[PDB]
């Protein structure tokens, strides 16, 4: 089910969702992929995470044109980090108004990264503060703790069984949980287990770094962090 368009990939995952793919070489682990998510909600779209730089990034909107030819409305990123944020420029370019964790946009200038223009705020319970949250649509926005970074945050598409745990989340294969350079690791197997918990009729769980996976990749994420304490 993989379209190739330039040098990126996009999957459907859903009559309304798919999948956006991008590549970066790093000499010492190959060209890794980042995945991010497109979903059409009635005469627009919405995008899950940048690509990892603005050029590929001009591509997710290209192929868009494409293959919905709708309005880009909107954009949520999922943390401070150069796959999930390095094409925030070729949005703002594009016009398309640009959502991410209030922690996310502190942190983005000392990264090499362009803030979002608006933050999002959390409720006690880690559900987003829904007037943070305009036009949304289908996409719910959950604050699972900190992980993988500080700032990280999931998605959930209602009307779907799909949840996004970006670089929180390994698939049940993997060997180890990736880059911990900013990790929180005395919290990250709770926040890994608390994102399960926030989207229990999820049944496919769609990430940064492999292929979406059944609900075992998170027992398993959560499971190597336990390592980690
Ligand atoms: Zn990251
Ligand atoms: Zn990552």
Not at 71 to 83: F, K, S
Request: hydrophobic residues 45%.
């Amino acid at each position: 089910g993989d379209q190739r368009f330039g040098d990126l990939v996009f999957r459907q995952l859903a009559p309304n969702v798919w999948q956006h793919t991008s590549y970066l070489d790093m000499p010492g682990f190959g060209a890794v992929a980042s995945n991010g998510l497109i979903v059409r909600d009635g005469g627009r779209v919405l995008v899950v995470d940048t690509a990892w730089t603005d050029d590929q990034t001009a591509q997710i909107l290209n192929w868009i044109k494409q293959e919905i030819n709708l309005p880009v409305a909107l954009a949520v990123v999922t943390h401070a980090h150069q796959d999930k944020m390095g094409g925030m420029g070729a949005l703002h370019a594009a016009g398309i108004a640009t959502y991410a964790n209030a922690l996310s946009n502190q942190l983005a200038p000392q990264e090499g990264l362009v803030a979002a223009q608006h933050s999002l705020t959390f409720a006690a319970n880690g559900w987003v503060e829904p007037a943070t949250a305009p036009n949304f649509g289908p996409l719910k926005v959950f604050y699972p703790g900190p992980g993988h970074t500080s700032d990280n945050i999931t998605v959930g598409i209602d009307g779907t069984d799909i949840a996004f745990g970006g670089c929180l989340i390994k698939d049940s294969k993997a060997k180890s949980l990736g880059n911990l350079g900013d990790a929180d690791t005395e919290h990250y197997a709770a926040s890994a287990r608390a994102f399960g918990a926030a989207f229990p009729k999820a049944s496919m769980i769609v990430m940064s770094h492999s292929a979406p996976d059944s609900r075992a990749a998170i027992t398993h994420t959560a499971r190597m962090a336990d390592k980690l304490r």
